């Protein structure tokens, strides 16, 4: 939830951190889909669904926080954590796949899955209102 912070004139917050989130909302529902159609179901093969869940929450809390900053930032750090850690298990789920382009595939989404998450983070930090944290240069 977002408190009172700043109100982006030229919509920076959808524009940037928007469709970043957008982009792991998507690429989550992508791999999720064709992993859980996917794979070979031989212990944490085949399916997710937790660290996926985990993520869209994340994701979308985001959305409901959007302008907050603060709340954002802390859930795009969690969703570092969520993303990475999904793309890893998909990164060992493709060395012992049955199909050799399902797996390429996979490590594919995979990508977009971690690449999307650095863009979230990157405009969820960007969009932070003034992000003057560290004393930056204050006058």
């Known amino acids: 939830g977002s408190h009172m912070q700043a109100a982006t004139e030229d919509g920076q917050l959808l524009r940037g951190v928007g469709a970043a989130a957008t982009a792991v909302t998507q690429a989550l529902n992508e791999l999720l889909q064709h ?29 409901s926080s959007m302008g907050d ?44 899955l971690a690449d999307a998450t650095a863009k979230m983070v990157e405009a969820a930090k960007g969009a932070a209102a003034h992000p003057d944290s560290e004393e930056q240069q204050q006058r």
Do not use: C
């Open 35 to 63: 992993v859980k159609a996917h794979a070979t179901g031989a212990g944490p093969a085949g399916r997710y669904d937790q660290a996926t869940d985990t993520i869209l929450t994340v994701t979308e809390n985001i959305f």
């Open 69 to 112: 900053a603060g709340e954002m930032v802390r859930q795009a750090r969690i969703l570092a954590q969520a993303t990475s850690d999904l793309v890893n298990a998909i990164k060992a789920d493709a060395e012992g796949e049955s199909d050799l382009e399902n797996s390429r595939k996979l490590l594919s989404a995979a990508k977009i």
